[model samples]
Target: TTRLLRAQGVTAPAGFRAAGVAAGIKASGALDLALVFNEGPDYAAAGVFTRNQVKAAPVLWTQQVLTTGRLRAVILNSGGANACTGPAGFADTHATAEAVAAALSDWGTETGAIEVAVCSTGLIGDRLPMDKLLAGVAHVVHEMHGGLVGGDEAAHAIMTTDNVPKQVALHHHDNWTVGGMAKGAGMLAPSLA
Candidate 1:
């Protein structure tokens, strides 16, 4: 059996912490960086990326890491797509992952074992402002917290043009919970994943 929760988002699940911050990525100075950390050795993750051939740098990074079925955290930014910048973009993604791993190392997680997934959205063919984005990652790490506040901030940070954040959750069989947050204004291809 399952029951829905009206307000809680992704951090409603156990073993998760999240945060969001402004990184000067957006011209409007909106919050453009979000972090989701899952402190679990047991939790598993799967991803379905855009089938489009011109995959973003973060997407490429994530595809390789997801093979382990374990993810320690996700770092997302919404300013530059981090796509089509060639080798530089991929290097940026790698650096972002390394930064996250180092920051969270005090939590007793191995840097090599920490699989930090990355995601980026906004204008295509642009490279991310690595300095600002990386600084934002450090900021989000400092601010990360469990529960609704963290989830709400994370949900908001990933937005590009959406007026409000989208979130949902369900409690199942009195034992487990599933939660999610979504962004993007248009149909990112409304079809089966």
Candidate 2:
């Protein structure tokens, strides 16, 4: 694997890179989009979701795709939970994954949308502005760099009401590293995401 970037989060690992961008999703125009990639010797991943009965579109889409136990990229946006919008909401999640897969192909990473994961947060029952979100997706790929900057940007982009980005990284003496990020911003009930 290539040398790990100086990232404090996921990008600190051997096979990951990340980016975050402001995609017109937030009213304040803050960073509201993020992308994470796996430049793999292997593409292995796992996810856990809310146990709530009303699962979001992204949650369903991801659950279906994760059966493969591999992922090429993960895309996340803040501004729309993409929940309760029914079929259209699920379609939007599909579209987002497809866009990520296609865009990453330009960088020589061959992938299908099924190998991509999507995550969304913010107001429920609202549809995402696909134009802006997809454009931001492309922009994120264009701007994504290695190291702490990209990791931090991605963490910041996923925030809905969080006070700060949450991330972690670790290394083993056996020449391996582990890293990840999470957004603890939750509502009145604040179930895990």
Candidate 3:
């Protein structure tokens, strides 16, 4: 049997924690960066990327890292889809992953870029403001260190034009559970899911 957990989002599972921050990626100062971590008694993950031919750099980066079959953290940002711009864009994604891996280390999470996934949303073809994003990563990591910033916070941050966040946590009677959240709705163009 499976039951729904309304009060929980991604962190409903054991050994996982998540949070979000206003990184100024959205000029309006909305929550534009989300940080999620796994404290690992186990480290396993799977991902499904857009089948669309025009892949975002972050999507490509994530697809490559998912090949490792393990992830310690996911650092995601909104307000920039980061689809084009060639090598520099891909480098931006790599830097985001590296920063996430490094910041997570402050809380005893031993991880590398290969074990981190970078996700981005919003307008394509724009470079993300790294000054804001890196600082946002550091801020969220500092806040979630040994504390709960709540998974819903991260969920709320990923929205582009979506007004409602899609979040769910399921508990199996056999003592296992999983929770996740997603954005990107109709009319939100170039927003990666």
- Model 2 earns a TM-score of 0.92
Model 1 regions more than 4 Å off: 190-193
* Candidate 3 Cα errors over 4 Å, as ranges: 145-149, 187-193
TM agreement with the true structure for every prediction = 0.93, 0.92, 0.91
How displaced is residue 122 in candidate 1, in Å? 0.4
Question: 1 or 3: which has the higher TM-score?
Answer: 1
lDDT of 1 by residue, 1-193 (tens): 7888867888998988998899898989998999998877575889888878878889889999988888888999887788898999899999999988887786556655348899988888988887898778778888898878899999999998799999988989878898899998964773323
Give lDDT tens digits, candidate 2, residues 49-159. 888999899999999988889998899999789999899999999999999988888767788999999999999999999999989988998877667789899999999
Alpha carbon deviation, residue 11, candidate 3 (Å): 0.4
Worst 10 residues of 2 by lDDT: 1-10
Query: Against the correct fold, how does model 1 do in TM-score?
Result: 0.93
What is the TM-score ranking, best to worst?
1, 2, 3
Compared with the true structure, the alpha-carbon lDDT of candidate 3 equals 0.83
Top model number, lDDT: 2
Q: Give the number of colliding residue pairs in candidate 3.
A: 0
Candidate order by lDDT, decreasing, is: 2, 1, 3
